[PDB]
Nucleic acid binder design. Structure first.
Ligand SMILES: [Mg+2]
Ligand SMILES: [Zn+2]
Ligand SMILES: [Zn+2]
Lengths: 99, 1342, 90
DNA sequence: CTCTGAATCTCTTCCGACGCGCCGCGAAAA
RNA sequence: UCCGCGGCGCG
């Protein structure tokens, strides 16, 4: 089976996992290492923020593909912000310096 | 937008918590059962976080975008997007403060060491089991002094209310608000100055550094204990609507509800002045609830739900394999992906793969939308999807057009190494399976038993170009682990090639002479001659000149028809000789590598594909098949078995006679069975491999057997001689599950019928192997993960640092066997210096010249024996390694490019083969060569023989050409019949000593006189059974008298007149010293000659675990003691089991002192003068001492030798560069012995690069650098002790790392690969590197 | 059609420089509508950009010259347009 | 003989491949 | 209706 575009997990805004859920494949850290072995920078960035997390990014990419421009517009992954808030819930202040 | 430059982490005061908060939760309610609506002031309080419907107030007062930002009046709900429910955080204000669990349970307890109080007391007061004194004046009770309740009564009645003593949380908070940072700091500094005990110094200094970090960070210790608790935004803790009106909830809801219940109960109890007992009990319960919420299971019995399962706390949400990090950061699931079962493809071109129609359509649906709208076949996305979903013909046409040149990525789980994912051009094929080229499948370590492969698509043209440039299969012929080709024919391809390259004595059309390969193909296709005919053919060839042109030639050579037909497709340029032989798999690989080196990529890939096609075609044509008769059983098998049975019967009879032992009988039975097995195996091989054919002259002659089984076995494609032995011979002895070998081997082969007992025996080994590999896969995966985590930073940054330090490389030789020739080791490296022609001052090869193939041939011709090469272990550079210091890439066959990430490549290459790694006196010269000795000190006896007076001599055999081919260790006191420089032949024993007997030598002739030799107190008189001679045995300290312990036995050498003979070269008398249990057969006054000995002193590693430990550098069980400094030896008083040993430097005025376990066998004598780092006690050696004494290079060489030996034993090939890279990564920590003029602190473990730069700039200023030593740390330790705390937290033990970073308040600078990955911006490696270079410009511009 | 970039690799000297330069050129191709310097043969933007980069007389410095000329000429055109507007006002 | 410091023991703390199909379950409150 | 757990099988 294959997945082009479907639902997402509510907590992390990432595509679900499983054929029965019409989900998408897993991209394990092994794959991340394999890409890093090559000079695979642009592909890694494209996969890890545009095809997975950035809702604004993925919507913009979808529209650009519709109009025929294959230009990435990378953005901050949402799961990272989820981790930020989760840590903040532990009383440990975490901020992003020089925004 | 965000473009944040760094990340700051620190403890948060309650003020900023209130700042983040958008209200307070006050009720333990979530939603109404009657109406699924958020409650008024519960965990989903809308007027705290936000609305549930976008721009729609709860009371419905506003429902349009025009009310953006409008706050409701009726129910106080601001009008905005619902997404905000993920950003605002709640807060709860507690009646009484409670501690934060991590700062107590996470060893070492920061709170306790800050307070200088043991953790036990902190726990007791915290959970309200005792009282502690905040303040005591004239009261005879100290601060931080703990009192129990009756002690509290006594204190209050004896002192009124002068003192103040309270329960845990509040008093801890008070005293934290009641401490002076700088005063305690200076007091501890003075204590450190005055301290004598080292352990107390360490405690003081760890407290000092903790308080210093706290001061510098500016955080207040009062913040350390929580009072106002943040509340996670509700959306991260959803309430899934379950069927039937029920719901699924996170454990977080339960934890928060329990905390709310306890808090409101506590406040309602407090406001009416309840008795202290219940209020304390409820405060304790509240503290327990807070701990459970933070980290359930961190203390005692974890709170659980109805399922009797632990509740997932925040720590659980972050920690663990399934935690937030590994699950959602580095393992994101992605769209535009698919998966399918794979299937073979025998006609696909190498750079392309077959793709199922439906899957391709589903994946590229957006592209189809875009182009269809572009072609205007529909007006909108709706019409587009309606048209595509019914699969009109135009849909398929567009799909064909879109994918014409569009690489896709194919990956298989697990992804062991960088070849686990590769790019391919897709070709649309009807079906439902992915078709693959066979060579890539073999390289994938993938089999078609039903393995599934996933597929991804790069959207951006940049990513597509990146995939085409690198990830394309054609551009990955050489394994990054080692330059050997990875795309290699296997199975039927090799079978067909070997079949076509053989030859028969008598074949159809044999003896004819053909024109060219065209005629060969024509003749065979007509069937007029076999492939095996030995024929003369005029073949032409070309050769690359010195100018790079192909000079032509031709001649008539005698070959086989198959060889000519194969040469037909050989690319023009290669020598013909490479195909004029039987071609095995290794032969094919070597030929292919030769083609790749000689010519460009395109000829090589064309050759590979054509080889694939031709080999498949002729393997199919040949039709090799397996028959029953192929497993020929030698007749002699029965005779061998009968002989073995007779001999074992005789052995059993003699054992019943008691003349032999059970163990001895077991051993000899094993040996005779092994011999019988060897005989039957050799009989099988001899019967199989050779076959008699009638020649052209009608005469029998031997030749290689065309037996199909033997044909497969020799070819190397899925066949090994052990399997053949099990097939057509006694499969031999088996192993019991304990590892013991059964006495009776499994006699029958598989062709023969197996007795049930034998099968039940063999199943033991079978299941043992299965379980072993089941565990091995997991262990290897874990080790690989650790290595990847450790070696993430190292990336090539500069072409050449300009260093001159190098490392020495020689071929590895043990037992007279060259395990690895120098050529393979040094190929692709970079010369440390100009290399001279051996024996002459002529520079053979210049410095900084890549050692390509021509240089390899040149050096091996010139009989070079040892070289010096630049290494990554000594590239003087920061945050990277000089390209010249790293050498040629193993993949692209040239010097590496600036931007490549070596560390990941090294880790993958070292970790991948782990799945194959297992986890469970007289020396005869082997060759005719010249005897050489190293560091050799020796004496000549009165017999003219050569005994050795050096303890660490090596004996080697150097060839007449200047090269060595043998290597052995020469024990001290051994006897040699050949001196240095003497030519000897093979098989000659020239080593003479007893391993069991330890001799003590005498320098010159004279008489031996005993001093401190007294019977009973030091020595004993005995009549030995061996000689019947009166013998003196030196008694050990425990055995000898206590008063006689001070009497150190000694032997002096006197002349014929009794005057002491002084040792030549010294004025000191010849004073030797017999240790305990030493035996001297001679007596006081017996004459001796030069080189006479009078003392006769009496005398595993699994594959993967040994490698893991060596990388982890766990301390060996018996550390071989080494010499701290050079000089003479001296002995002192004896401890219980230990002795005081002092090394006095020859010129150094400071004789180092050491304590030696006496029951450990020492090697040195008192009179010996040794060098620093010498092996004082023989045994296993810890790397740490090796580093601290000898230096980095010895450590590197030792580690490389060990790892290479292990892999060689298993039989895998790994280039040294990866091991060097790992080691270089392991040595980033340095301890500051003295700061000099630097600003650092003594004894501080800092980055070696940091102190390097600091000393560099200080000397640039003419200042004094800082004295420093380097430390070798285990991979785990050296990893989690890094600076980019985020990476360490991602790795393991997130609690410890996070706590330390928080109490320190660090600041990461996004220099790590994993760091940028988690952040999600361009990595500073590969293509992105140049971009970050521009970044380095922009940050410099700004 | 292309099977390997080795020719372009030796033409430019590095994988990553090749990637960046070709990506920028193809970006100019796809949205800028600039006609390729190499015959198309119905290939995509990626393939034609690769063909241009391999010995099609394109490098980083060449495209830098191109963009410098483009910005200079468009600034000149804008100056002429502003001058024309001023003259119309006059 | 008595104390202090280092070693040894006891207790505590981490962490044990990676994909992917299935199945059947979870919660009630008054 | 998005979650988790338990078992089974594939590599
Ligand atoms: Mg398989
Ligand atoms: Zn309202
Ligand atoms: Zn260097």
């Amino acid at each position: 089976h294959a997945r082009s575009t479907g639902s997402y997990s509510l907590v992390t805004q990432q595509p679900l996992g499983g054929k029965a859920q019409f989900g998408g494949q897993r991209f394990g850290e092994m794959e991340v290492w394999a890409l890093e072995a090559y000079g695979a920078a642009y592909t890694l960035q494209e996969m890890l923020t545009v095809k997975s997390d950035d809702v604004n990014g993925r919507t913009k990419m979808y529209k650009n593909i519709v109009d025929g421009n294959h230009q990435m517009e990378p953005g901050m992954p949402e799961s990272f912000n989820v981790l930020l808030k989760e840590i903040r819930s532990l009383g440990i202040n975490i901020e992003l310096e020089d925004e | 937008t965000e473009e944040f430059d760094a990340i700051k982490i620190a403890l948060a005061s309650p003020d900023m918590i209130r700042s983040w908060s958008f209200g307070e939760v006050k009720k333990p309610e979530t939603i109404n059962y009657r109406t699924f609506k958020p409650e008024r002031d519960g965990l989903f309080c809308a007027r705290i976080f936000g609305p549930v419907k976008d721009y729609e107030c709860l009371c419905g007062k506003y429902k349009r975008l025009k009310h953006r930002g409008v706050i409701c009046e009726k129910c106080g709900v601001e009008v905005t997007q619902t997404k905000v429910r993920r950003e605002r955080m709640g807060h709860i204000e507690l009646a009484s403060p409670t501690a934060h669990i991590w700062f107590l349970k996470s060893l070492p307890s920061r709170i306790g060491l800050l307070l200088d109080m043991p953790l036990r007391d902190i726990e007791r007061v915290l959970y309200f089991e005792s009282y502690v004194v905040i303040e005591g004046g004239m009261t005879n009770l100290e601060r931080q002094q703990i009192l129990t309740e009756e002690q509290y009564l006594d204190a209050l009645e004896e002192f009124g209310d002068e003192f103040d003593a309270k329960m845990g949380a509040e008093a801890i908070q008070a005293l934290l608000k009641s401490m002076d940072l700088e005063q305690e700091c200076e007091q501890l500094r003075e204590e450190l100055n005055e301290t004598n005990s080292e352990t107390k110094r360490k405690k003081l200094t760890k407290r000092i550094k903790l308080l210093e970090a706290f001061v510098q960070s500016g955080n207040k210790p009062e913040w350390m204990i929580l009072t106002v608790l943040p509340v996670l935004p509700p959306d991260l803790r959803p309430l899934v609507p379950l069927d039937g009106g029920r719901f699924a909830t996170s454990d977080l809801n339960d934890l928060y509800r329990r905390v709310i219940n306890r808090n409101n109960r506590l406040k309602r109890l407090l406001d009416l002045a309840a008795p202290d007992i219940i209020v304390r009990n409820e405060k304790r319960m509240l503290q327990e609830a807070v701990d459970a919420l933070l980290d359930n299971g961190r203390r005692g019995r974890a709170i659980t739900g109805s399922n009797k399962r632990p509740l997932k706390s925040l720590a659980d949400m972050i920690k663990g394999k399934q935690g937030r990090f590994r699950q959602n950061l580095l393992g994101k699931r992605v769209d535009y992906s698919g998966r399918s079962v794979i299937t073979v493809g025998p006609y696909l071109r190498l750079h392309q793969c077959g793709l199922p129609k439906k899957m391709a359509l589903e994946l590229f649906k957006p592209f189809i939308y875009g182009k269809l709208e572009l072609r205007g076949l529909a007006t909108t996305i709706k019409a587009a999807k309606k048209m595509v979903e019914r699969e009109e013909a135009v849909v398929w046409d567009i799909l064909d057009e879109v994918i014409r040149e569009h690489p896709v990525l194919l990956n298989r789980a697990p992804t062991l190494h960088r070849l686990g994912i590769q790019a391919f051009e897709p070709v649309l094929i009807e079906g439902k399976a992915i078709q693959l080229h066979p060579l890539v499948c073999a390289a994938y370590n993938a089999d078609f038993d039903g393995d599934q492969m996933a597929v991804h698509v790069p959207l951006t043209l940049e990513a597509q170009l990146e995939a085409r440039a690198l990830m394309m299969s054609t551009n990955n012929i050489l394994s990054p682990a080692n330059g050997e080709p990875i795309i290699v024919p296997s199975q039927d391809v090799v079978l067909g090639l070997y079949y076509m390259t053989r030859d028969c004595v008598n074949a159809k059309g044999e003896g004819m002479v053909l024109t060219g390969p065209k005629e060969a193909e024509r003749l065979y296709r007509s069937g007029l001659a076999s492939l095996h005919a030995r024929v003369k053919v005029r073949i032409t060839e070309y050769e690359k000149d010195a100018n790079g042109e192909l000079v032509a030639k031709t001649s008539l050579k005698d070959t086989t028809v198959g060889r000519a037909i194969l040469w037909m497709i050989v690319p023009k340029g290669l020598p013909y000789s490479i195909v004029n032989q039987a071609l095995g798999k290794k032969a094919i690989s070597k030929m292919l590598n030769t083609c790749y080196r000689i010519l460009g990529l395109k000829p090589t890939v064309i050759f590979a594909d054509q080889i694939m096609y031709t080999g498949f075609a002729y393997a199919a044509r040949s039709g090799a098949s397996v028959g029953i008769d192929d497993m020929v059983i030698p007749e002699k098998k029965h005779e061998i078995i009968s002989e073995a049975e007779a001999e074992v019967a005789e052995i059993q009879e003699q054992f019943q006679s008691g003349l032999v032992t059970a163990g001895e009988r077991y051993n000899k039975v094993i040996d005779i069975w092994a011999a019988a097995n060897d005989r039957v195996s050799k009989a099988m091989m001899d019967n199989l491999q050779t076959e008699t054919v009638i020649n052209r002259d009608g005469q029998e002659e031997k030749q290689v057997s065309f037996n199909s089984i033997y044909m497969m076995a020799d070819s190397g494609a899925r066949g090994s001689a052990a399997q053949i032995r099990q097939l057509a011979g006694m499969r031999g002895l088996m192993a019991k599950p304990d590892g013991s070998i059964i006495e009776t081997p499994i006699t029958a082969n598989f062709r023969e019928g197996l007795n049930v007992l034998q099968y039940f025996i063999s199943t033991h080994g079978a299941r043992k192997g299965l379980a072993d590999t089941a565990l091995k896969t997991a262990n290897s995966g874990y080790l690989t993960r650790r290595l990847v985590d450790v070696a993430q930073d190292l990336v090539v940054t500069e072409d050449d640092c300009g260093t001159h330090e190098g490392i020495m490389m020689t071929p590895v030789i043990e037992g007279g066997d060259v395990k690895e020739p120098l050529r393979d080791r040094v190929l692709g490296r970079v010369t440390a210096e100009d290399v001279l022609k051996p024996g002459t001052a002529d520079i053979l090869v210049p410095r900084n010249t890549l050692l390509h193939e021509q240089w390899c041939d040149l050096l091996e011709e010139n009989s070079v024996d040892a070289v010096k090469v630049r290494s990554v272990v000594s590239c003087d550079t920061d945050f990277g390694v000089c390209a010249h210091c790293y050498g040629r890439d193993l993949a692209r066959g040239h010097i590496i490019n600036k931007g490549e990430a070596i560390g990941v490549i090294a880790a993958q290459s070292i970790g991948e083969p782990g799945t194959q790694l297992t986890m469970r006196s007289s020396i005869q010269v082997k060759n005719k060569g010249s005897i050489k000795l190293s560091n050799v000190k020796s004496v000549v006896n009165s017999s003219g023989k050569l005994v050795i007076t050096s303890r660490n001599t090596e004996l080697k055999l150097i060839d007449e050409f200047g090269r060595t081919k043998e290597s052995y260790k020469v024990p001290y006191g051994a006897v040699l019949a050949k001196g240095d420089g003497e030519q000897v032949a093979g098989g000659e024993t020239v080593a003479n000593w007893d391993p069991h007997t330890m001799p003590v030598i005498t320098e010159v002739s004279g008489f031996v006189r005993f001093t401190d030799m007294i019977d009973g107190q030091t020595i004993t008189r005995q009549t030995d059974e061996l000689t019947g001679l009166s013998s003196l045995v030196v008694l050990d300290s425990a055995e000898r008298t206590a008063g006689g312990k001070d009497l150190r036995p000694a032997l002096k050498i006197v002349d014929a007149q009794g005057n002491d003979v002084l040792i030549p070269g010294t004025d000191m008398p010849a004073q030797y010293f017999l240790p305990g249990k030493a035996i001297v057969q001679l007596e006081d006054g017996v004459q001796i000659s030069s080189g006479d000995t009078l003392a006769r002193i009496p005398q595993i590693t699994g594959g993967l675990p040994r490698v893991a430990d060596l990388f982890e550098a766990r301390r060996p069980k018996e550390p071989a003691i080494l010499a701290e400094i050079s000089g003479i030896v001296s002995f002192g008083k004896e401890t219980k089991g230990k002795r005081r040993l002092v090394i006095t430097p020859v010129d150094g005025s400071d004789p180092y002192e050491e304590m030696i376990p006496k029951w450990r066998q020492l090697n040195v004598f008192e009179g010996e003068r040794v060098e620093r780092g010498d092996v004082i006690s023989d045994g296993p050696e810890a790397p740490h001492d090796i580093l601290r004494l000898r230096g980095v290079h010895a450590v590197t060489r030792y580690i490389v030798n060990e790892v290479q030996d292990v892999y060689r034993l298993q039989g895998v090939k790994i280039n040294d560069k990866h091991i060097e890279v790992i080691v270089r990564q392991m040595l980033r920590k340095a301890t500051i012995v003295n700061a000099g003029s630097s600003d650092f602190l003594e004894g501080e473990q800092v980055e070696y690069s940091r102190v390097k730069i600091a000393n560099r700039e200080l000397e640039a200023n003419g200042k004094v650098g800082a004295t420093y030593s380097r430390d070798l740390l285990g991979i785990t330790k050296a990893s989690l002790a890094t600076e980019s705390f985020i990476s360490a937290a991602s790795f393991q033990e997130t609690t410890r790392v996070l706590t330390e970073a928080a109490v320190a308040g660090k600041r990461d600078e996004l220099r790590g690969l994993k760091e940028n990955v988690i952040v999600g911006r361009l990595i500073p490696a590969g293509t992105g590197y140049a971009y970050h270079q521009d970044r380095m410009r922009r940050r410099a511009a700004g | 059609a292309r099977v390997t970039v080795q020719d372009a690799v030796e033409k430019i000297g590095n994988r990553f420089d090749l990637v960046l330069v070709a990506a920028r050129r193809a970006r100019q191709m796809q949205v800028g509508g600039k006609d390729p310097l190499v015959p198309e043969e119905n290939d995509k933007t990626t393939v034609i950009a690769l063909r241009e980069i391999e010995e099609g007389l394109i490098n980083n410095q060449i495209l830098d010259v191109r963009e410098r000329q483009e910005q200079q000429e468009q600034e000149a055109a804008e100056l002429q347009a502003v001058t024309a507007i001023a003259e119309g006002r006059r």
